[PDB]
Amino acid sequence: ISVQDSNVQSILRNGKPKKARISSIKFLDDSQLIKVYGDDLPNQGLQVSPTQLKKILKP
Amino acid sequence: QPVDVDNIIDRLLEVRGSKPGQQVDLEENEIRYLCSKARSIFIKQPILLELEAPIKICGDIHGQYYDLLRLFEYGGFPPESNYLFLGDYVDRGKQSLETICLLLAYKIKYPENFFILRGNHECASINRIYGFYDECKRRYNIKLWKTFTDCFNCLPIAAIIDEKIFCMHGGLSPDLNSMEQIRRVMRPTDIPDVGLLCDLLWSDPDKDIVGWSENDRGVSFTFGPDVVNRFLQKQDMELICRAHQVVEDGYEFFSKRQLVTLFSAPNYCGEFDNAGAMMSVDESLLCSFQILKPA
Ligand SMILES: [Mn+2]
Ligand SMILES: [Mn+2]
C-alpha cells in the first residue's frame, strides 16, 4: 500500500545531452524470453519460451 | 476544495482484490482536476517523447480496469517500474473511467517516469460511439466527456526509447520522412481523417503485402515488412513497438523481429481468448515479455 518514491529519477531526455553511451537492443534468449502469470500460475511468474507459452495459453 | 492526487490513487487502488466490477466513485471535480492537470503536463511535454530505459511498454486496455490493476501487480506499481502506454484506454470495456483516471493520476504524480500516448479511441468522434461517452453520461454528465476530449486532444503521439525503439499506437505513415514532421504537429488537435497523424494512430502491418495497401478498417493503410525494414534502415532504428490489433499471445513479432504488436487486454471483450503482454526494456537494452493469462 506504499511505494519507495523518494528517489524517482526522470527518464525524459528531450532537452538533455545525447547519452554519451550507445547500445543495440537485444531480446533475451528464447528460453528466458517470456514470463507468464495468472491465477493458475505462481506469483513470481513462470519463465517459458515462445512455444512453451502457446502450450500454457492453449493446451 | 484542494484536490489530493495521492488520496485519489489510494481510492482507485482500494478495489484490488474486489470482484471485477466494483466501481470507484471519484467526485466530479476530482476527475476534472485530473483532466486539466494532466492536460497541462502533456502540453508542457514534447509531442514526440525521447525516453531512456528501463521502461515497460503496454498496449490496449479498453476499459478493462481490473486487467490494468493486474499489469501493475506483476509489472510493479509506479514508480517501482517506469511505464509507456500505447493508447486505447477507453471504450468497449465496462470501466473506462477508472482506467483513464488511474493513468492520469500517475501521470500527474510521476510526470517524467509514467507516459501515455494517444490511441485512435482517444478521439471524441470514436469514443462518442464505442462506450466512453455513454459511461461518462451515465455516471456524471456530458460536460465531463467534453473535459476528457480537451485532455485527449493534447496527448503525445509517439515516443523513441534510447534512439532505437519507435513506439506509436497504430503504425507507420507513407508521409513519414523525418521525425521533425511529428514534432511540428500542433496541439490541441483532433485526429484528422487522412494524413500523418491519422496513420500513426490507425495503420496496421500486413505480413503478406509489399509496400502500402488498403486498410479494411476504412481508415489509413496497411504496410508490409519491406516498409518496416526500410524505415528502420533509413531512420537508424532497431524496433517498432505498436499496439491497436488483438494478438493471441499478447505480443506478436512482425518482419522477423523488426516490429512487435503489444496488446494488454486479456480475454478482450470476452469474445477473444487472448493473453495480454507488456514488453520490458532494461537498463542495458535487453528486452523480454511479461504475459498475463486471462483471469
Ligand atoms: Mn484498440
Ligand atoms: Mn486502436
Residue numbers in the entry:
A (entry chain B): 348 to 406
B (entry chain A): 4 to 298
What do the authors report?
mRNA 3′ end processing is carried out by the cleavage and polyadenylation factor (CPF in yeast; CPSF in humans). The phosphatase module harbors Ssu72 (SSU72) and Glc7 (the yeast protein phosphatase 1, or PP1). Glc7 dephosphorylates P-Tyr1 of the CTD to elicit transcription termination.
To understand the molecular basis of their association, we purified the Glc7-Ref2348–406 complex, but this was refractory to crystallization. Therefore, we made a chimeric protein where the Ref2 fragment is fused to the flexible C-terminal tail of Glc7. We also included two repeats of the RNA Pol II CTD in the chimeric protein with the aim of understanding how the substrate is bound. We crystallized the chimeric protein and determined its structure at 1.85 Å resolution. The structure shows that Ref2 wraps around the back of Glc7, burying a surface area of ∼4,200 Å2. The absence of density for the RNA Pol II CTD in the active site could indicate weak binding affinity, crystal packing constraints, or a requirement for CTD modifications such as phosphorylation or proline isomerization. First, an N-terminal low-complexity region (348–370) of Ref2 buries a surface area of ∼2,000 Å2 through polar and hydrophobic contacts with Glc7 (left). The other two Ref2-Glc7 interactions in the crystal structure are more generally conserved among PP1 regulatory subunits. This includes the non-canonical RVxF motif (SIKF in Ref2), where Ile372 and Phe374 insert into a hydrophobic pocket on Glc7. Finally, the ΦΦ motif that is found in many PP1 regulatory subunits is formed of a pair of hydrophobic residues in Ref2, Val383, and Tyr384 (right). Tyr384 stabilizes the formation of an intermolecular β sheet via a π-π stacking interaction with Tyr77 of Glc7.
